[model samples]
Target: GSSGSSGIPELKDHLRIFRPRKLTLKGYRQHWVVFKETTLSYYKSQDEAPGDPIQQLNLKGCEVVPDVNVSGQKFCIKLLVPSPEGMSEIYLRCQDEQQYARWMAGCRLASKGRTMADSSYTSEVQAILAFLSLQRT
Candidate 1:
């Protein structure tokens, strides 16, 4: 299989985003973020070694903040994941509007046990749906 065609079906659908550990970090580091079932995992690159991730977050009981307004930030969102410790917020941003819509929709779908591809809709519709979803969230 091609590197992009990993054995796991969910891994095949992903988006590259900037995930800065700290909101105050200098710049956004590129990451290949994948949605698997109820989990969100990210890697340093698309072809990063298997079974190793820079970080992973479970979205089982998470609230999706599809749009976030951080100063000087664009195409931003946050996943509010609850844990025994407390609520953990996963911050992410995309380079453009389309990428943001895709990631927002894909993550929301995965959290609800659905995949974006499973939807029988055109990309244009899906993108609009994603934007609407973000507005409603």
Candidate 2:
């Protein structure tokens, strides 16, 4: 049994997920996903299956790095999600420019346990990078 099933939500969409494999740049698939404060819920395609989320990641203590898909000429959000296997480098790209901004900024804010709400997203990223640079030194 899963812990919670409340209807609470955040940003939902069909995102292109590129999770790396052993020695290949692969695993590109689209799943119905929901991005909450610090959790991510991904469900299998509607045609194939379960009502419950296939996987959920508690993204606290995660790292967000913005990059681009040089091959596809797209905006990308690179993140490190912590787990027993340590951090996994996952690349997520949104459907469009606005979505790229909305969700990228959203996750950036989530990493810091707050919001970029209005005009602070650009400002906050440097702030976000600063703390990490100061880590373990």
Model 2 clash number: 0
lDDT of 1 by residue, 13-132 (tens): 334343455453546555566766557767777678466886567765567775644233356667877666665666666666656666666667666766555552135336654654
* TM-score, cand. 2 vs. native: 0.62
lDDT of 2 by residue, 60-131 (tens): 568888774434536678877777766567778765455676778778777777644434665654553443
Where in model 2 is the C-alpha error above 4 Å? Answer: 1-9, 20-27, 47-51, 69-73, 115-137
Q: Which 10-residue window of candidate 1 scores lowest in summed lDDT?
A: 11-20
Every model's TM-score: 0.58, 0.62
Error of 1 at 106 (Å): 0.7
Worst-scoring 10-residue span by lDDT in model 2: 128-137
**Winner by lDDT:** 2
Predicted model with the maximum TM-score: 2
